Every structure is written in C-alpha cells, then in structure tokens.
Design a protein around this ligand. Structure first.
Ligand SMILES: [Cl-]
Ligand SMILES: [Cl-]
Ligand code: NA
Ligand code: NA
Ligand code: NA
Ligand code: NA
Ligand code: NA
Lengths: 296, 296
C-alpha cells in the first residue's frame, strides 16, 4: 500500500512581507500537519484535504473562510470545491456567505445531494438544511482586508493528497480577488480549473489569477501532460507556461501522481506551500528557499 | 479563408415522441439558419453562436430561456456560457432568474466586466446595471414544465461555429434538470465541461447529465483527443465512451475543428441537432437518421 502524502498551498501571487511570512509559515505547517495526521490514522484522501483546507479557512492569515478578501461592496463571498479521485465524485459551492467553512459545505454537496455544485441562495438554503451555523458576516471580515478594499478602489488556498489505499483528492477554497464584482465566481468551484482528481493519473490544485486558470483549464491540463508521460515537474511547468504565454496569466499549482511523486511550482512571484511525506515536513514561499523539518 | 459552419444541439435526452419530432426540427433548423445567416454576413463565430442560442432560449419547446425546466421551488434558474477561441475569452452566468436571454448576459460578462463568471444575485445586479429587462417567471414557465415537475414531485442547448476568418466559438444555455435543488449548477457555465473553444484546436458544446459532464470535463476532453491526432468523430466516441464507463452518465456533443470538420454524437437515446455549411442544412434526432437539404 502507498505511503500517504499531503501537499498544501496558499495564494500564488506577488511578494510577501517578512512578519507575514512567519505567520504564513505556521499556517502552512498547521494544515500540512493536520492533513497528514488524518492520513496517518487511516483516513481517506478526501478527509485529509478537507482537513488541511479547513485549517486555512479558520486561519485569518489566508484568503479563505475567515480572512477572505472583500468584494467591491465589502462583503465576503466564498467559493470552494472538493473531488474524490476514485469515481471522480465532486462537490462545489460558489458565492456563499455567512458560513465558516465553504469546503465542508462543499463536501456535503458531494455526499448528501445528487448534485456536484450549488450557488448563492440555494447553497445558503442547503447550509441551513444541513444545520451549518450562520455567522455574522463581520466575523469573516478582518480589519486588514478593509484596507485592501478601501485602498484597491482608490490568493486561493488548497490541498492534494494520496492516501494509504492509493486514492487521491483535492480541496480548494477562496474569497477570490480584492474588489471583485458581486457574485464573481472564479476557478475554485469549476472542476478541471481550480483542481482535478482522478486515481488513474493523480490530483492537482491551482492558485493565482482565477479567470486565467478557468480559461485554460489549468488543473486538468496539468494532468493531461502526466497522461502523456511528462513527469510531474515537467507537466506543471508546461501547463503554467501555457497560461503565461496564451492568456498572460500567472499563478501556481501543486500535484501528486498516483505513484507518489509530487511537486509545487509557480509562475507568480511567490506561493506558500508545504508537503508532508515519509515523516518529514517540507515548507516554502519563495523559489529555492525551502525548509525540511521532522514531523514527529 | 475558411468555409463558415454552425452546428446547433438541443437536449441530449430521452425518447422524443413521433408527434413532437417535427416541432423540435422546426426550432433547430431556425436556430441554425440564424447562426448561419450571421456567418454569411461575415459575422464572427461568437456572434453566430449567440444568435443561434438566443433563438433556442426564446423558443418555449427548448429547455433554456423560455421553456426552462423548474427547480424544486417551482422556479426557473438558468445557466449559460460563451467562449471565443481566438484568445480564450469567455463569459458565463449561473442561477439567473427572470431574464429572457441568459446567453446574452454571459457575453456581456465576457465583454463588459473584468471577469468570466457571475452568479445569482451578483448576476442580477450586473444585468440590471446593463439594462437587461426583468421578465416575470410566469412568462418563462411552460404548461409542460409545470406538469413535468409534478411527475417528479429534455436538456441543455448549444452551438459551435467556425467563421470566415478561422475563429471558433461555442455557446450553451439551459434551465438545468427538473426539480433540481435551488441554486444547483450543472456543466453549462463551467468552461471545459459545458463547452470549450480554441482556434488552435476546435470548439465543442456538450449536453446530457451535467454532473457526469462536469466530472469528466467532457468538452476539454474531446479536444485533448483531437489535439492527439484523432478525427472529430473518434474524439467524440472516446470522450463519450469514457464518460459512460467511468461515471455511468449519458449525453452528447457537437464539435467543429479548426479545419472545418464537424460532427454531432450522443450516447443518450436522442439529441436534436442541425448544422449549416456550404449552403446545406444537415439535421437529425435519432442516430443514422439524418437528412440534407438546400438553404436559401
Ligand atoms: Cl509509496
Ligand atoms: Cl474551408
Ligand atoms: Na497566502
Ligand atoms: Na482564512
Ligand atoms: Na427556450
Ligand atoms: Na476573458
Ligand atoms: Na470579461
């Protein structure tokens, strides 16, 4: 049976301040750690990635759940999806409000409906039906996000895993881009763009410019090259380069093959990432500055 | 410069009655003659796919715009998308209510906003700001879909085109599936699933069970096979073959390649379709049951 793996990412975007980096490092650590714990206790790939993403949702340092960037009217509107590599079963929500964990709502879409994707009003009704708390909107909104919205007027997080039965899955969640139009949905809830997971290939979650990732189908394009026998680093580079060269888009991705190989590559300035395997934890943000600590 | 071609499809769905076949043929042949007439003026592939789909939206026999199926709460919520293969520009909307023409609003999303995807209340706001008129739900609901729902308590339409300057496009529009949960979203506004266009390969629109179509990312998949060297037909066979085996889902698709080669194919029992090229209309509903006619 397979040695499990989890890989996590935050936003594939521009440079990050030094104080942030420390808060960021700990966040990538907490979610990688949380996800791997699940796998080391016999849990599924879906459990793991759901677990890591929740961690980043609950962490105000990340553009997902509490800490989501603001729309053009200063409200949080969140998108997410999750996908089971075994039968390709999937769950998604877009433009959901007043909840803590869009990724869990996403998981409920998959497991407790015959659908794959709900939006806005219906998503909110379904939440209520599932006994998902409704939190005051102001709780998701941070003071620092306000300064982004007030200023801008005048990145997506996620996870992939390979589990101890050799199954794969991705989860992704975002608040989107600062000053987005109300009801702007990006790449996250859109299968093949914000992520893709198939047991016959591997799994991918993307991040960066939502519209660009959508236009080129970045997650599934990444896996196609793996289908043709490109290596994981070979495929991520080709796929990302094509978003750059065709639609002028930048961003990042992480991947795990069904054989255990993994990578994190980004054409954006930075992308916080972490990978746990063989009892060790890998972490970074900027190119060629990784650390590798022991995960007891 | 290339010979222009438009292909249109109705819903990839169940047996059609002998009685009802003629009237679907009527609306389909109309849809195609609109698209083709736009192309003959040297209109763009994007113009041609939009007008073709506006005709099916307005026609109450087809499940998009007027004639949309009803959700669990008795109402019409609509999805649509359009894509320009020249630069991968796209627009899409989901869960929109009380407007005649979803496909027209997805194009406005492509052209007028920095985004490709608006949903529900955000889409209402944008449609208002652009002067789209509020249409009552009662003028979108057919007696058939008032009744059909009760049976529970048809399908997605599209077009692809290649214009007189080598540009390919797709457009697609739907009411979804009868008694769907409020705010359910199918493949139709998810780029790569409901359709995909790329001047460097071709354009596809899909129909059928939208959850399956999302899972397999059916439209991008067909283009993967084309790129790999397969004919439009083989590619259709392989992607629909895969969807059937892997997720036990049925549907169909139209595809036109960069070289002006085209096909309509389905694994459902029925898929109304019509194509116009070289002054000829080809149309059918059942397999190997095609007729050709001259066009004015
Ligand atoms: Cl292994
Ligand atoms: Cl030609
Ligand atoms: Na981040
Ligand atoms: Na967060
Ligand atoms: Na209609
Ligand atoms: Na665009
Ligand atoms: Na746009």
């Amino acid at each position: 049976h397979m040695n499990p793996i989890v890989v996590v990412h935050g936003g594939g975007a521009g440079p990050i301040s030094k104080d942030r980096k420390e808060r960021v490092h700990q966040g990538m650590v907490r979610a990688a750690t949380v996800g791997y714990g699940i796998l080391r206790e016999g849990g599924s790939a879906v459990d793991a990635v759901e677990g890591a993403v929740v961690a980043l949702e609950d962490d105000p340092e990340f553009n997902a759940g509490c800490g989501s960037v603001l729309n053009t009217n200063g409200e949080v509107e969140m998108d997410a999806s999750i996908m089971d590599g075994k039968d390709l079963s999937a769950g998604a929500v877009s433009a959901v409000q007043c909840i803590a964990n869009p990724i869990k709502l996403a998981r409920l879409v998959m497991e407790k409906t015959p659908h794959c994707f709900l939006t806005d009003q219906g998503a909110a009704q379904f939440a209520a039906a599932m006994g998902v708390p409704e939190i005051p909107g102001e709780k998701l909104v941070t003071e620092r996000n306000k300064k982004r919205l007030e200023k801008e007027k005048h990145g997506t997080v996620g996870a992939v895993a390979l589990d101890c039965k050799g199954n794969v899955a991705y989860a992704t969640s975002t608040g989107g881009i600062v000053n987005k139009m109300v009801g702007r949905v990006g790449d996250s809830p859109c299968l093949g763009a914000g992520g893709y997971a198939d047991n016959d290939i591997g799994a991918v979650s993307t991040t960066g410019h939502g519209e660009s990732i959508l236009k080129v189908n970045l997650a599934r394009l990444t896996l196609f090259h793996i289908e043709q026998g490109k290596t994981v680093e070979e495929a991520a580079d080709l796929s990302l380069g094509y978003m750059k060269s065709r639609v002028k888009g930048l961003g990042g991705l992480i991947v795990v093959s069904k054989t255990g190989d993994w990578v994190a590559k980004w054409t954006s300035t930075s992308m916080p990432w972490a990978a746990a395997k063989d009892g060790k934890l890998h972490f970074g943000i900027d190119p060629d500055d990784t650390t590798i600590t022991d995960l007891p």
